[PDB]
């Protein structure tokens, strides 16, 4: 029959076949379950969607059409769970959250 992507069978956008190949070649285990790469691709696609949504929100707030690293940093740091996940992660040209301590404010 005609070739049909396993991603389509799972209804995803992440290449499950590439995932399975990488899992096999990654020396993680001798045998790889059949339904494993599907699960992994689904999780990866979901996380990507989350970060992309937040970054697009930020870029719109800046009245810009293209997400830049600054938008990514702002989205990640502003989110609690995402920032916790990327606690030890550095993003190039990410800048920092604009934040000034209260006691330094004029009074």
């Amino acid at each position: 029959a005609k070739a049909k992507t396993r991603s389509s069978r799972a209804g995803l956008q992440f290449p499950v076949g590439r995932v399975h190949r990488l899992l096999r070649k990654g020396n993680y285990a001798e045998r790889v379950g059949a339904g494993a790469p599907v699960y992994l691709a689904a999780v990866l696609e979901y996380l990507t969607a989350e970060i992309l949504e937040l970054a697009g929100n930020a870029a719109r707030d800046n009245k810009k059409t293209r997400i830049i690293p600054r938008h990514l940093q702002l989205a990640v740091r502003n989110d609690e769970e995402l920032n916790k996940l990327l606690g030890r992660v550095t993003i190039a040209q990410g800048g920092v959250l604009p934040n000034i301590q209260s006691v330094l404010l004029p009074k």
């Binding site: 550095t90 604009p98 330094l104």
Partner: protein, 100 residues
């Protein structure tokens, strides 16, 4: 009676904190940083060549680390009921971070 305008101390400081908490571009001059990196990269081996991107990544990581350390030092100095950072603050910060 002619006096020259000048803001009070702490005004320009807050303005610059706002300015640099907004942009993301690098702050250190490129060539001095490159020269320093190459000089440091001599006690391990001689006549080492460099991809430019490697130097860029070094600059980025170093600047991010220094910014984080600066912020931690600022928190320490504030905890000492002060607004000026002094090296003991940095030392305490690094000590708590475990680097010391």
């Amino acid at each position: 009676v002619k006096k020259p305008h000048r803001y009070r101390p702490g005004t320009v400081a807050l303005r610059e904190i706002r300015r640099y908490q907004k942009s993301t571009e690098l702050l250190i001059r490129k060539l001095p940083f490159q020269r320093l990196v190459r000089e440091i990269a001599q006690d391990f081996k001689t006549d080492l060549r460099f991809q430019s991107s490697a130097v860029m990544a070094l600059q980025e990581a170093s600047e991010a680390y220094l910014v984080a350390l600066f912020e931690d030092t600022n928190l320490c100095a504030i905890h000492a009921k002060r607004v000026t950072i002094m090296p003991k603050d940095i030392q305490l910060a690094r000590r708590i971070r475990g680097e010391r």
